[PDB]
Design a protein around this ligand. Structure first.
Ligand SMILES: [Ca+2]
Ligand SMILES: [Ca+2]
Ligand SMILES: [Ca+2]
Ligand SMILES: [Ca+2]
Ligand SMILES: [Ca+2]
Length: 590
């Protein structure tokens, strides 16, 4: 077996996780969507370690991806609706946006690891008898591509174990061409993969056996696992092979390629903790993680699965994992369930509910107020009790800002935010060790606030990796940090006076029609600031139809319906500011 099976998910022991999952991502709906509102909302939640994002959506939405891919995008064939909106487009366009990349980098910037949801049916149809109006021909076109493509047919014939029951060869094609490409593109930005509906497609239809410990019985599981590991060899994999046994071991036995347990709770649909017997069965799963120190399969007659990490994927609301207006647990219970499961135990991806997940029906992609409240109480508990004694650091990473050669550097590490004393006495001091830059300096500017400051020279062009050391009465705790020099984008000229600049003047965008427009303005593509100052954009003149709205610090969305009188050549003036500013003309033919 694999010697690092489960060890690569060692960080998941004691890990608190959330879920951010929009719905109805197809046909360009996900393009321009950002997670930055959600992350700003949870800025004070400091013990949280990771967030699960989708690559695909669940159930019949498994073909719909939230990241671009040439092969998936070729299945579109420019097909349109009655309104003119896309149909059979089950991924964002390469020319328009890569939303998943923005969320991955924003999560990394926030000091968090990431889990990636993939439904195992992927581009195949879960119910072939039915027809999905928004993407009806995609499943057929994907299979059409697999059996009529030189590289794909060559791959299918390269191993004897590809051919078999049902749509087996097509599953291998997704792993090789789609999943591997996604994995290798994003690299270490993805820390984990959870594969839903695995036994449904892999075991029952395609004829693998996840209960076995022969690799010849688990080649579809291998292909998916190796495709992830080709991009990041430390990426923890988990397969949903249904729920285990409520009386004994609650997790279904690990395959040869499970680093952690998927951990679907008992009573899938409906409220997972009603009646009292269902509450107890799912709480026994939480207690099982405590009892076995976060290792799922120490009990059985297999030593190769002893490092596999016990992990649970419950839902915070009463209805769904990604939404719901009612919490299933009380405030006291939610803190107990979480702490019992992770504190010297396993990991939990909480199905944290957003206010409204449907992108077509006025989406609000931030946590329910009651859900945030439960995490605030959990945060206060885990700050004190998860790792008592020496100081604890926040989340998984501490991210220092990039080095701008010549410019002043300044970043505060605040007590209570980036580090804290569990007992609540206080931080006695903060120092560093290792190869620091000569210019860089640590000092306590105000009470409970240490500042990493200094001014790099213009010739600064190297990386630095060193330890930060938070100290209190009980002892001292280390935290590795990185300092990288900024890489400016191509096609941008530095004015050398602090002025933020547009890409060009004029700047023409795509054409519009009288009845909705859609276009994105992005940092480093359409506008840029060489000091890295946060920017503001304002429409200062032009026709009324063009609506401007900010999605994040680095993304702005242009929208709105042109009237009959707006046909021709519409000119707008757009400003970009930080004190200093500069205008530009933006033309749009209609
Ligand atoms: Ca933590
Ligand atoms: Ca064992
Ligand atoms: Ca639509
Ligand atoms: Ca202490
Ligand atoms: Ca500036």
């Amino acid at each position: 077996p694999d010697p690092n099976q489960g060890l690569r998910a060692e960080w998941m022991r004691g890990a608190l996780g959330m879920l951010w999952l929009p719905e109805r991502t197809f046909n360009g709906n996900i393009e321009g969507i950002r997670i930055d509102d959600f992350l700003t909302q949870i800025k004070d939640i400091r013990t949280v370690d990771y967030v699960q994002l989708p690559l695909t959506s669940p159930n019949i939405f498994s073909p719909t991806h939230v990241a671009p891919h040439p092969i998936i995008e070729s299945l579109w064939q420019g097909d349109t609706d009655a309104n003119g909106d896309p149909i059979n487009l089950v991924a964002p366009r390469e020319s328009v946006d890569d939303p998943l990349l923005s969320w991955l980098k924003a999560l990394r910037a926030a000091g968090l690891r990431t889990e990636i949801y993939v439904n195992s049916y992927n581009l195949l149809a879960r119910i072939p008898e039915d027809t999905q109006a928004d993407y009806p021909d995609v499943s057929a076109r994907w299979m059409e591509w697999c059996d009529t493509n030189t590289e794909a047919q060559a791959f299918i014939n390269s191993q004897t174990y590809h051919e078999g029951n049902g749509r087996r060869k097509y599953m291998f094609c997704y792993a090789e061409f789609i999943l591997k490409e996604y994995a290798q593109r994003y690299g270490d930005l993805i820390d984990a993969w959870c594969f839903d509906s695995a036994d449904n497609v892999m075991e029952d239809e395609c004829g693998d056996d996840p209960a076995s410990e022969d690799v010849n019985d688990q080649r579809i599981y291998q292909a998916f696992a190796d495709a992830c590991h080709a991009g990041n060899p430390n990426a923890a994999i988990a397969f949903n092979n249904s729920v285990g046994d409520r009386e004994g071991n609650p997790f279904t036995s690990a395959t040869l390629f499970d680093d952690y347990t998927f951990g679907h709770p008992f009573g899938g649909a409906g409220n997972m903790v009603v009646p009292e017997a269902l509450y107890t069965y799912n709480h026994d799963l939480v207690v099982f993680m405590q009892t076995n120190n976060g290792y799922a399969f120490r009990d059985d007659t297999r030593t190769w699965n002893d490092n596999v990490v016990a992990h649970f994927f419950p839902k915070q609301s009463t209805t769904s994992w990604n939404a719901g207006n009612t919490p299933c647990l009380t405030d006291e219970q939610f803190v107990e369930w979480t702490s019992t499961g992770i504190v010297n135990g396993g990991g939990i991806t909480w199905g944290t509910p957003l206010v409204r997940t449907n992108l077509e029906n006025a989406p609000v992609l931030t946590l329910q107020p009651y859900a945030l409240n439960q995490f605030e109480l959990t945060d206060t508990y885990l700050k004190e009790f998860q790792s008592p004694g020496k100081p604890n650091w926040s989340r998984q990473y501490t991210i220092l800002p990039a080095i701008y050669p010549g410019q002043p550097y300044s970043h505060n590490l605040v007590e209570g935010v980036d580090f804290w004393d569990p007992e609540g006495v206080g931080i006695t001091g903060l120092t560093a060790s290792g190869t620091l830059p000569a210019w860089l300096t640590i000092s306590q500017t105000a009470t409970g606030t240490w500042t990493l400051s200094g001014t790099p020279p213009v010739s600064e062009a190297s990386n630095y990796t060193f330890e930060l050391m938070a100290q209190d009465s009980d002892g001292v705790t280390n935290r590795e940090v990185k300092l990288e020099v900024i890489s400016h984008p191509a096609g941008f000229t530095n004015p050398g006076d602090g002025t933020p600049v547009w890409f060009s003047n004029p700047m023409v965008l795509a054409k519009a029609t009288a009845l909705d427009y859609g276009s994105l303005l992005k940092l480093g593509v359409d506008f840029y600031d060489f000091e890295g100052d946060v920017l503001t954009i304002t429409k200062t003149s032009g026709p009324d139809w063009l609506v401007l709205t900010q999605n994040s610090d680095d993304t702005w969305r242009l929208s709105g319906m042109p009237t009959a009188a707006d046909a021709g050549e519409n000119s707008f003036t757009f400003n970009v500011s930080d004190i200093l500013s500069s205008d530009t003309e933006i033309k749009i033919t209609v």
